[PDB]
C-alpha cells in the first residue's frame, strides 16, 4: 500500500465517521446508505458490521474499515452503483453529478477537486465517466 491510498482511505473512513469519534456506528452507515438512495434496515446494518467486527465491540474502526474494502475487493451490482451517480441516466457521470453525490455525502469540494476526480476515473478523455470507465474504477 502507498502513502496516497492511506490518505484516501482515511478520508473515505471520514465520509462515514460523521461525528469524528474514530468509529462508524450503524447509525452512520444507515445515514450514508440513505444519502446514496438506499434504505437498509437496522438488521442489515448490524450484519454489515458483524461481518467485520473483529473486536466484536459493535462498531467499525479504521483497521476493520480497511478489512471491508479488502473483502469487497474480492456485476448487476455495478450498474446500480453507477446509476447512483448517473443522476439523469444519460450514461455518463459528469463532474456536476459527481459533485452532487459528494455533497450529498456531506463533502465540500472545490471545483478543481471534483475535476481531479473526474480526471482519474476518465480513461478516454471526453471529460466524463462512462459505465465502462465506472466499471474499471470499481475494479481498481
Amino acid at each position: 500500500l502507498t502513502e496516497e491510498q492511506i490518505a484516501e482511505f482515511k478520508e473515505a473512513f471520514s465520509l462515514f465517521d460523521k461525528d469524528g469519534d474514530g468509529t462508524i456506528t450503524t447509525k452512520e452507515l444507515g445515514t450514508v446508505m440513505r444519502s446514496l438512495g438506499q434504505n437498509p434496515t437496522e438488521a442489515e446494518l448490524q450484519d454489515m458490521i458483524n461481518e467485520v467486527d473483529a473486536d466484536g465491540n459493535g462498531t467499525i474502526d479504521f483497521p476493520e474499515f480497511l478489512t471491508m474494502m479488502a473483502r469487497k475487493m474480492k456485476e448487476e451490482e455495478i450498474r446500480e452503483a453507477f446509476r447512483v451517480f448517473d443522476k439523469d441516466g444519460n450514461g455518463y457521470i459528469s463532474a456536476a453529478e459527481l459533485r452532487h453525490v459528494m455533497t450529498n455525502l456531506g463533502e465540500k469540494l472545490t471545483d478543481e477537486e471534483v475535476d481531479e476526480m473526474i480526471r482519474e476515473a476518465d480513461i478516454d478523455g471526453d471529460g466524463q465517466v462512462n459505465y465502462e470507465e465506472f466499471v474499471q474504477m470499481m475494479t481498481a
Binding site: 484516501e8 473515505a12 442489515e44 455525502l105
Partner: peptide, 21 residues
C-alpha cells in the same frame, strides 16, 4: 482522492451483499 468515491461504493456493495428481502 478518487478513493473517496471508491470506498463509498465498497460499503455500498457491502450492504447489497447483506440485504434480506
Amino acid at each position: 482522492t478518487v478513493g473517496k468515491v471508491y470506498a463509498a461504493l465498497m460499503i455500498f456493495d457491502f450492504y447489497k451483499q447483506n440485504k434480506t428481502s
